Symmetry: C7
Subunit: 302 residues, 7 copies
């Protein structure tokens, strides 16, 4: 179609569809994850090989606990120890054990900016008068300003969906986390340090905290993004092509969840009147992999 040619023609799908859509779904309840996949085989005899479109769907939960509960520790210990396992990285892999992973979705696109360069200049003039013991003034101003502005459609932290290293064998994605505006103040990230508060991305009372248990001094789950409390739903699409000479293959479909443990403690300097929040990188990881046979003669999948 890029050469004033008919659309949906250069595109495979003319007198050859057979549309052999298959589905297989599975759950790993230990980390309460739900895999989904959607394959459709297209075998056009005009081509040399048989094409198969793979669509992964479903969702994968954050499953956000607070696993270290030391409420205040008034007298013996220098203070509380409350942690929260906030997930950060969500790597998804499809490792072919055959034939190449031809297409990969989504990809990288443009980022939208609006940089502004403003200049303004002014003039002034005034008069003041008096009669009885009092002095008059005068004024005649002149001003000139230059303003520069920036603005980008950054998707808060949400979870940015980058396309990490591909292969015709191993496809990967690393949908990371960036930062959030806790209680309308922001934007704070995983790096932002304060001399007397630490990281406040997960702080609840943003002015001065009453001396309460840190198990209930966290900003609530739903006071944070929709994904961070619920889970992301993949829509990643991949395609596999194999020759009519070639036959059955054995795919792997891995889904992972990196997790971070943002912690609140007075034990990490001060924290008595205020309350300090801290973050230690890459704490929890869990993996669940699964293999699948791609039949190519009857164009099923088990």
């Amino acid at each position: 179609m890029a050469q004033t040619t008919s659309q949906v023609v250069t595109d495979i799908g003319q007198n050859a569809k057979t549309h052999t859509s298959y589905n297989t779904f599975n759950n790993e309840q230990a980390d309460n994850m739900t895999m989904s996949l959607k394959v459709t085989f297209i075998d056009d005899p005009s081509a040399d090989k048989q094409i198969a479109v793979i669509n992964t769907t479903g969702s994968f939960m954050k499953a956000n606990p607070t696993l270290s509960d030391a409420p205040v520790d008034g007298y013996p210990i220098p203070g509380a120890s409350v942690t929260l396992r906030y997930p950060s990285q969500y790597d998804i892999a499809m490792n072919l054990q055959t034939s190449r992973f031809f297409h990969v979705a989504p990809t990288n696109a443009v980022e939208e900016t609006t940089v502004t360069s403003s200049v303004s200049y002014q003039l002034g003039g005034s008069i003041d008068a008096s009669v009885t013991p009092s002095g008059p003034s005068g004024e005649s101003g002149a001003t000139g300003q230059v303003d520069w502005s920036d603005s980008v459609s950054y998707d808060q932290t949400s979870y940015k969906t980058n396309l990490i290293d591909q292969t015709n064998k191993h496809v990967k994605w690393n949908v990371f986390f960036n930062g959030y505006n806790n209680q309308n103040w922001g934007i704070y990230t995983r790096d932002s340090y304060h001399a007397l508060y630490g990281n406040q991305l997960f702080m609840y009372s943003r002015t001065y905290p009453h001396e309460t248990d840190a198990r209930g001094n966290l900003v609530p789950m739903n006071d944070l993004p929709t994904l961070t409390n619920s889970g992301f739903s993949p829509g990643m699409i991949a395609v596999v092509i194999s020759e009519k000479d070639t036959e059955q293959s054995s795919i792997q479909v891995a889904y992972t969840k990196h997790a971070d443990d943002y912690t609140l403690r007075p034990g990490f300097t001060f924290g008595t009147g205020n309350w300090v929040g801290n973050n230690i990188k890459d704490v929890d990881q869990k993996t669940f992999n699964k293999s699948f046979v791609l039949d190519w003669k009857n164009k099923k999948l088990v």
Copy 2:
């Protein structure tokens, strides 16, 4: 399409077993809710299994009463408790019995949220001259400044499975003054989320000091459009899904918890006060491809 493929090929619906649309509707009047469902069976011979799409519509009423008319009977602590049951969460769950089949693709989900952080910087210069009387007397001025300006500008999915899928319809904020949330704290007012009149209007009962001017949903109701999909083997015959409908509610009251000078009425609201549940099961016949 995104795979340089022809449009509408990867998706099923070709020489497939019709669009067996079924329908079932009922009303639970106690909380006056009206459930609706519309299933469509697709039996693709090219596929290995049989597809069925479940679409949930209809409507759920809020039925928001004012159950505490204290200011009207005995004025306890001048101008007392008027309560309002503002519902907050609306969980809808579909829990298939843990022996039969698997749940599959579900709509809606959570989505990326986009923000726009701005960084503006401006710098200027100044200059002026003054005149006076009493023979001879000018002044002068020469300014220089620089500014930096920064500007900026919920349907949650609680744990799902191939067996139990659930959603959490949260609440975000309200305004003509600034945003206030389900937790917004005032040192001398508490939560003022639905406050109308500050400092008392006429020492009136709080039955008529509430802001009426608020969203369409509360009172009227939102209509769900949630979609789910189930696929089952061609050999197997039946299944027993559950469909739970819930309404968690909060009870914001306007009472003299605190009162100062001109009756500065105080408002407080506490989460998840009232709950109501309404479940019903449905038979997933797979050989005759219906559902009651």
Copy 3:
């Protein structure tokens, strides 16, 4: 992962029926309209029928009290105008459960800091001055939209029996919204939602004109609300009701105690009618038979 027009019912179906019935209620100058279409999918369990309500209902906004206009208190401004506020339209299935069902429509930080520097001079003095400023701002703003004129097709409670809609009124910018946010207040003006002149003369011509206000408020809204009823092949008849209502308020002005006042629903009139949904021959409250 589904195709287009595949989850939708509409395959190898049977005669789409598409009947019509229109009538006028002239007392309140009302025009009722209905759009029924029966669709009988053999693949389904039951028979589907889509009802589309159309036509219109006029506001016909008068000023019905123009006489106190001479002298002595309560005089040349005791002018009332019956401005309607709420427009509920109801479809109450005969309490017997013909299974109502699906329905349409439905319901749904800045910071700036600066720095300064200056010098002050004179003519024959002894010393100059200097200045070094520092500023920092924090700005928070909001803005709402959607249905400002508030003709919002809210969906008040539906059932398997009675479906309803409430297109109410919130507020508008009369003249130039110099005041009145919406059924609001003023300590010396009252409600200014319907004020033309703040100082001004007969009060019949000191009102902001009918056409100086939104298109609907002077003319009337046309419903397009559609509902669908599905019933078993066992059933052969149905009995919906179709109510049309017009709640109205009587906004009145005053010279002084220029005071204006909004008054909650005072006078209303309704026009409802039921319809027979014959399912074995697809007739309505009209026409006859055949064979």
Copy 4:
């Protein structure tokens, strides 16, 4: 409707009223669905109607040939379809009326030292800050029935050379309405025919004319045989006038308008002739 019904009997009938240079147009297509109960017919009104904006002053009457100059600027354009109160029932009319679709607070702090009266400071400040058809041709659906349907495309106000905003109702402080004024005090004693903003210096429609696209539909039983619909077209006019001598002071020009001065209507009926649907007056 209109599914596997065929017919699609598009007819056309046009006439011109040259006195006010109006051009009526109609576009009917009859659809007879056997699945339906009755016979459907959609009528589409098109064509145009001119504004014909004159300045008909200083006309055979002439010390003041440059005084009291009027312009008959139209305001309302009502289009009506009045079936006689004994026929087949009017139904759906297009278009309809639709819904038409900020608060900021900022607080700051200050503090300064003036060195190198003024030798100290400490500030605190707080601020609170709060799709118009400017070419006002609002297309309202004014009172109708299943017998007489009407429309009121009225006019509201304009942005005179981006300077305003003035309406036909709101009046300049001590000038009346200046919406069609070009120069307020520069031409001190000039002829009043030429102190207006040109016809083209204001919206596109105001000097030329609107083309209707109003569509209506009539349905009648298959038992019934004939109908006698009427379709009226009207043209209201306003009288904005310019004169000098207001309160003197550099020739303040008086701008005034006494509303609803001239009116014109152009109606004609048509026989639908269901028998053959000829929809062109006449008879059977």
Copy 5:
């Protein structure tokens, strides 16, 4: 309902697209036409849609050039203003109706203060407490059944990034002046043509569409198709005391016409 159907297109017979193009080189104008005759049996009459395309040049000269002459230099430029297009059917034949495109409508705080000041021994502290409270419009003159007209006026343009000047903006007019300060030939003190709007230096490309219907009994018709160009003569003078450059223009100076007739045969739906 049947409201958005109005289906003439359906089973439209003969699809008789015709084409004819011509040029009038004197004013470098190019007329184009696209006719299609449709004889729909469902209709009463036979319909024919005419689509006008092509282009028309501005051809902007400066034909009065006295280079350096209180009395100015008198260099004028004939910048055209109005572009009238007329279609004059003889006042006895069938009807004309419908016109595309059409005209459209146009879519268009309280604060507080506070401060405190400190100073030295006999000076005194201060305070503060503030409070505050705050063009190528395409017009469609009336259609008729025979004689249709178009005018499509223009008002003004914004000279290089500054201000706005119209066909009535009174330096005098600087609409076509480049530098006002102060003295070459006045033929070359104008802002360059490509530094001015795209239309002013090129031309307009008509896209006007019209439709004609005629009764099945009657035969042939004799339409006119006029193309016109009203022109204005903007004039430049370099002082007409400081030496500033003054610009003047008077409306409706030059007009030129190029008309052509066409036979509407109706029994075979050919247009020559």
Copy 6:
């Protein structure tokens, strides 16, 4: 109202050639449609391909050396581009062508000494790359000038072929002034890719025209001209006034590279003229 109903044919032809002197690539896409319902036969011509800018600084190559006359850097940056289509003054007809606030105040102050108050009461563009114009067409010669207007160099702007300054001249392609690296200005120009996508790479024409001739008529030798035009901005610390003020000025049409090839339209003989005979 559009030709394409029971019209068959669909005889898409193509002819491509390269002009290596300016490294230009002309492309053509003709499709003949002979609708029997019409009177004449329709043929749609679509010109595609691209033409490189090839923007040099003709004062280049390693310098160091022993130069007396300062630096003297020039750049031949093209401005206008044209795609004329001139059918021979005796052929068929060309029928259609594409593209075508107030406030108030009040305040109070308090002080020391007898009677010490004080009061206050206040009361108050498709720039940056080119333009796609259509100079007047005819039924014989259709021709357009895709010229260039202005750019915002290094976040400062906007500057244009007319942009003036009292002490720098035109700075449209300036990187930095006053003392810029005070080296050769060959590496003091704003980089070519710091400028529009077109200016450093080349524009791809997409102009569409259509030719129709009567079923009676024969032959229509057309001609497809392709041209370019460059501006010559000069910048040097050898014609200026020393004291920094490194000024630079720009002039008009200086370089041109026209390319032509009268493809015999063959309004019935298809095979557009190509390598004439065997190659």
Copy 7:
């Protein structure tokens, strides 16, 4: 109908992919042959897909993190240019339509009076002020493709077609805009800086702005979707295209160079240091319309 390819029998889409693991590049290509009998020649559309990784190392990361002698000598090899070329052998030729293309970059370029009175007591009266000002603001803005992905089409031919997806600039920690030539008097280039001043002791390998704190492309890989088409006469028999894939790289480095300062980290960068290329030829058979 203006578009060719309708009922165009041959749609013989083939695919051929390979990976070069040393610099971890993976080439992919997608051709479909269409043989239109109405035309004179046979058309073949090639779609380049797959991806190419940045694989961004810090290869000079301070060996043992030595403070005064090694000091601040951590570099980062950030690639800049990504040229993709298709060079037909000089006997076949006949390149035609190429996607994507270039386009116009879009830009958007864009008085008061006073009066007041002051009053006091003591031998004194009122004061006055009457201001008058006027300002003229001038702004501009485009939709910057700032991060990277400026997708230019350098000169095409019937022999060699090329693309230069360059890199332009970035907003380092939301401040900008900074480019490869952005100089500061005391810091050099800050395009790749994390911390504007560290108190003397951090490793400079972990003093970089994090990888994901930089554009999506910069840390992962660009995925081409670039399409080209080759047409050849029915007389001709075969052709030999080249498909080169390249990655020019820059070495952004913090190096003593000019000794050191008061703990402030200087950043510098020199262009186009290391590059890697991966080319391969392919036979475009035209009789059986395959391609190895």
